[PDB]
RNA sequence: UUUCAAGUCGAUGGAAGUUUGAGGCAAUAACAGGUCUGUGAUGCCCUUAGACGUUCUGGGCCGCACGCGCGCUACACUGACGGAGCCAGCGAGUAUAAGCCUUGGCCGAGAGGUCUGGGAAAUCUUGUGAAACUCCGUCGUGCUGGGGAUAGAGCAUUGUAAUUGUUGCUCUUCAACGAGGAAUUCCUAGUAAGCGCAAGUCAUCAGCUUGCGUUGAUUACGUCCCUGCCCUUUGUACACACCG
């Protein structure tokens, strides 16, 4: 409830599920910086790991920082909501998933092809690199 | 059945515009003018006012007695009502 | 891009600021900010200490605005 | 002359029996407090996690103190705010129905509130007793 | 057969559930009040029924 | 982040989907099938099914009866396109209209729960130049 | 009974009724104290019917308004003028109309909506437009 | 079933018809030494009908505003059943219908 | 002030002193203006049994290298979130249906589900406890907690039927945009601007209109410089009237 200082116990960088977190934004925001984690999901993972939100990233201790990475590959572990997640009734074993930095962009290419090998119509116009969601195309989206 | 009264007064009005044409169109060769609707107890008295009232009240007033038929028939109405 | 405000409290910089502040007429979120190159979110703790040590006087209190002077 | 809650701030009253009843202890807290969000139109759950129950509950009491048999529907577009539809223009939405349901039968369970006549939920016997009781240890600073 | 085919198709809840009084048209139709006239057919009943302009 | 190691493993792996594997997918009965799929096919099926998706079902199950040399099914013809697959009729080949004409699609097991008509574009792709 | 008399203060669509009764002059708005106006910023605009004559004005009369209706702002308006014709209205009827005239005074030469309701009101809206006099732009 | 606590409710679209059975039937109510509570002036409702004025779409975007004024009142007597029906045949009137709950 | 006339500008009183504010109606003629896609309104032409009638199934009206118009979100700190305070008006609402407005209670993170009750309505939904707004906090000039497209996975509702996602909700992805060239629109007081709410379309879907109210200004109260129209004078070989 007060200033206090420090000395070399400071991180500038850190790394996370090997993507680089700037040390000096709170901690809550900071792992915003690793995609498939969002502000909602760092919110909850920070509570379940007793790690209050008042702490810049770079604050953190090591004990801290394993302790979070582990909920995160778990999160059904520590009493987080299916609903919650990321990946939630996983296509082919079924179970409620998160994936991460690396795994998420796998996955989601795995289902990209799941689409278009079945030759789908939301499958091919993603293909096209079109609109899928039935959105009008004859007057938007005319960038590149 | 229960009718509110926003939706009575629209639908007394409503049936006034309906049975106005409709004498516009059948009794055109009398010069028709216009019609009144008396509402009243055990009765709905309506008074067309025409040019002709001949034509409407003709051969022992066989058509006003057949075209009163045609609105007991069309409205539900009962006989004497 | 060229701001990189300090947003951790070192030694050196704690007593200069107990140094510096109450030579201010006038001191705020922003004139913390603007002089003593240290954040928003540490400056605001460090006026609502300041204010209870006793070396500054609370001028008017607001979230949005706090009107801070010298005590002196 | 005596003290009631219409004689007190509502801001710096709600602050107190907030903290009354968190040092209390006695309120039953659900499981899903650190997790849920308020409202669907609101984005991100409530900042202070430990005290937000406390006190949303204080504020439902006080609310449910200056009116008469308010049921749990009329809480939930209370506490409801602007929606952030993205490109769509803002809209009104509702307040959780669970975290006010459980408010209220929270409150229900401490004594402070009962089930009305005709709907709604009254202030209890006791109800008053004890709101009024935090309003005079409020305004003696 | 024929007659399990023919008009079989539901028309309630649509548009085509409903039409005029006057003209049976499907576009353009007033339900307030119970009125089932379509726009154009209302302005040269509103008269009668009693409806009027005043401001 | 401690450390991180993919080493993916398998065991003569037949398709799965959502937990079920091929083997038993396909003899599980549709009513069982619909309970592990998504939103939109359970709500379809608790609705009530019309006499139509369960005509199809039956034409198409006679259809594979009608060859026992194990080559495709031939192809059964239809109109109704809004139908669920289910694994009942994986290996089927159907011909699903688009408006015009009958697009042929064979019932591949990773086309299980999808609208039969949804692998038969209904228009030509627009192609300027 | 007692000397009461009883107005009212009008802004927009906001209506404040005023019970100006007799007593140890007792000010409540809805049941709560003047002191706890929820809009700070604006917490002198019914200050000023009380500090313009004098808080002495005040000791044998008590006061006990319900406003309803209008907005945030629009709900100050109503009260201080139910106040102030209030204070007015019971000085016309149980005091000498001397002092009556002498307060009515204070009160005109500072703010006419003391007194007197404003009569703007809002003006209705045209088709071919978002608003009253605004339209939908133009395009040739 | 005798003397008993009998509302009469009116409605019409035009005030004067109206206002002459309300008070013709007030007027029968006081030289017949009856109590009565009104005439109670209801909320008027304005039913309001905006259309496009173009049958076609060409043109200005002009808009009509039709109106339907709808007048209700309420009527509370003390007198016996036969009495107040009775009443009522003195001050029919084509307009305004007549609606009789106890 | 004025031809001392019509009037105009200031004060005072007044609820109201701009036609008190705002609208509805609105002349003599006219346009090849728009609609036969509103009419069991219509003349004529075409078709009338392999129909251009009507009905059923499915698709399309949404289709996408592009140009243009009405708009909505925004580009941040006069701000985002998180709690807390908590105020309108215009309106609508059902029965043996083919199902209306739906409180209150109970489940559910939500979306939503379920059981009763009220209301054909100044009675109940409803004080529609709306949003901007205000207070206290977090954030701290960072493509950042601005912005929320695009997309993946999942949960509900309506509907026979949602695939080309009807819509809603949950997690995740988090794009252009850092205030916009030449040009150009609307507007003078409870007005402009924000800000929402209701009614219409409507089984579902409002970034749309028609209204309503909340907060509420800057700047003229003048001119013919641009633009359009009207009048007078003028020219005319036009009168089907310069589309001559
Ligand atoms: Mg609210
Ligand atoms: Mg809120
Ligand atoms: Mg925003
Ligand atoms: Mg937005
Ligand atoms: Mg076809
Ligand atoms: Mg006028
Ligand atoms: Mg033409
Ligand atoms: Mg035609
Ligand atoms: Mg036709
Ligand atoms: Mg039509
Ligand atoms: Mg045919
Ligand atoms: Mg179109
Ligand atoms: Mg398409
Ligand atoms: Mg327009
Ligand atoms: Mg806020
Ligand atoms: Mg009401
Ligand atoms: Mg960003
Ligand atoms: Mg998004
Ligand atoms: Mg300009
Ligand atoms: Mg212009
Ligand atoms: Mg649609
Ligand atoms: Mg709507
Ligand atoms: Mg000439
Ligand atoms: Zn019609």
């Not at chain 4, 409530?46 to 006190?55: D, H, N, R, S, V």
């Not at chain 4, 529907?73 to 929606?83: E, F, P, Q, R, S």
């Not at chain 6, 379809?44 to 495709?72: C, H, Q, V, W």
């Not at chain 6, 239809?78 to 042929?104: A, D, Q």
């Amino acid at each position: 409830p007060l200033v206090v200082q420090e000395q070399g116990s400071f991180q500038h960088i850190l790394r996370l599920l090997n993507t680089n977190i700037d040390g000096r934004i709170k901690i809550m925001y900071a792992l915003t910086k690793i995609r498939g984690v969002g502000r909602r999901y760092a919110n909850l993972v920070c509570k379940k790991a007793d790690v209050e939100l008042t702490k810049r990233a770079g604050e953190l201790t090591q004990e801290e920082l394993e302790r979070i990475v582990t909920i995160m590959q778990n999160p059904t572990n520590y009493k987080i909501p299916a609903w919650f997640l990321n990946r939630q009734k996983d296509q082919v074993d079924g179970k409620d998933y998160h994936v991460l930095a690396n795994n998420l962009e796998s996955k989601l290419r795995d289902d990209l092809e799941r689409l278009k090998k079945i030759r789908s119509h939301r499958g091919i116009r993603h293909f096209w690199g079109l609109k899928v969601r039935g959105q009008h195309t004859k007057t938007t989206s005319r960038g590149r | 059945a229960i009718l509110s009264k926003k939706k009575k007064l629209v639908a007394d009005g409503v049936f006034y515009a309906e049975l106005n044409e409709f004498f516009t169109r059948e009794l055109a060769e009398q010069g028709y003018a216009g019609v009144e609707v008396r509402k009243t107890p055990s009765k709905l008295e309506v008074i067309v006012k025409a040019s002709n009232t001949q034509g409407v009240l003709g051969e022992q007033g066989r058509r006003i007695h057949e075209l009163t038929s045609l609105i007991v028939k069309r409205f539900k109405l009962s006989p004497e009502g | 891009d060229k701001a990189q405000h300090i947003v951790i409290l070192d030694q050196e910089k704690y007593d200069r600021i107990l140094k510096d502040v109450p030579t201010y007429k006038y001191v705020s979120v922003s004139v913390l900010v603007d002089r003593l190159k240290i954040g928003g979110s540490l400056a605001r703790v460090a006026l609502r200490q300041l204010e209870e040590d006793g070396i500054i006087t609370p001028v008017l209190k607001h979230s949005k605005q706090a009107i801070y002077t010298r005590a002196q | 002359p005596g003290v009631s809650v219409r004689d007190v701030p509502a801001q710096d009253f709600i602050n107190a029996y907030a903290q009354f009843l968190q040092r209390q202890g006695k309120l039953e807290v659900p499981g899903y407090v650190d997790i849920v969000k308020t409202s669907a139109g609101n984005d991100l759950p409530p900042q202070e996690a430990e005290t937000w129950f406390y006190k949303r509950a204080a504020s439902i009491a006080r609310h449910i103190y200056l009116r008469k048999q308010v049921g749990v529907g009329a809480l939930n577009k209370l506490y409801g705010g602007a929606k952030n539809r993205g490109f769509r223009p803002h809209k009104h939405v509702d307040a959780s129905g669970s975290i006010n349901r459980k408010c209220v039968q929270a409150l229900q369970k401490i004594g402070v509130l009962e089930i009305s006549p005709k709907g709604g939920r009254r202030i209890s016997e006791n109800g008053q007793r004890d709101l009024d009781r935090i309003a005079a240890q409020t305004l003696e600073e | 057969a024929h007659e399990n085919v023919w008009f079989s198709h539901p028309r309630n809840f649509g548009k085509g559930s409903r039409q005029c009084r006057h003209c049976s048209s499907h576009s353009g139709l007033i339900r307030k009040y119970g009125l089932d006239l379509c726009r154009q057919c209302f302005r040269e009943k509103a008269a009668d029924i009693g409806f009027n302009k005043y401001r | 982040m401690v450390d991180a190691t993919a080493p993916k493993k398998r065991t003569f792996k037949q398709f799965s989907f959502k937990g079920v594997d091929l083997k038993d997918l396909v003899e599980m009965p549709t009513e069982e099938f619909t309970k592990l799929c998504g939103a939109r096919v359970r709500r379809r099926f608790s609705r009530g099914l019309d006499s139509k998706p369960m005509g199809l079902i039956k034409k198409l199950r006679a259809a594979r009866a009608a060859t026992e040399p194990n080559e495709r099914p031939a192809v059964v013809k239809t109109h109704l396109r809004n139908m669920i697959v289910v694994p009942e009729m994986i290996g089927s080949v159907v011909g699903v209209y688009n408006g015009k004409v009958f697009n042929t699609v064979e019932i591949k097991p990773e086309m299980v729960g999808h609208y039969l008509g949804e692998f038969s574009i209904t228009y030509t792709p627009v192609r300027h130049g | 009974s007692t000397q009461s008399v009883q107005t009212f203060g009008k802004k927009k669509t906001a209506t404040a009724v005023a019970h100006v009764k007799a007593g140890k002059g007792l000010i409540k708005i809805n049941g709560s104290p003047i002191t706890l106006v929820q809009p700070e910023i604006l917490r002198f605009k019914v200050y000023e019917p009380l500090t313009l004559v004098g808080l002495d004005k005040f000791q044998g009369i008590d006061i006990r308004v319900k406003v309803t209706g209008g907005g945030h702002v629009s709900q100050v308006y109503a009260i201080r003028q139910a106040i102030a014709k209030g204070l007015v209205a019971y000085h016309q009827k149980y005091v000498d109309e001397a002092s009556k005239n002498e307060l009515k005074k204070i009160f005109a030469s500072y703010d006419k909506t003391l007194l007197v309701a404003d009569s703007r009101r809002m003006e209705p809206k045209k088709f071919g437009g978002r608003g009253a006099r605004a339209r939908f732009q133009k395009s040739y | 079933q005798q003397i008993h606590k009998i509302r009469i409710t009116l409605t019409s679209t035009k005030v004067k018809q109206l206002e002459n059975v309300s008070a013709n039937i007030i007027r029968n109510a006081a030289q017949y030494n009856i109590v009565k509570k009104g005439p109670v002036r209801m909320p008027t409702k304005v039913l309001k009908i905006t259309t496009r004025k173009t049958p076609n779409g060409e043109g200005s975007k002009t808009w009509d505003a039709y109106e339907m004024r709808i007048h209700k009142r309420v009527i509370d007597l003390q007198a016996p059943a036969s009495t107040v029906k009775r009443i009522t045949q003195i001050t029919i009137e084509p307009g305004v219908d007549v609606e009789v709950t106890i």
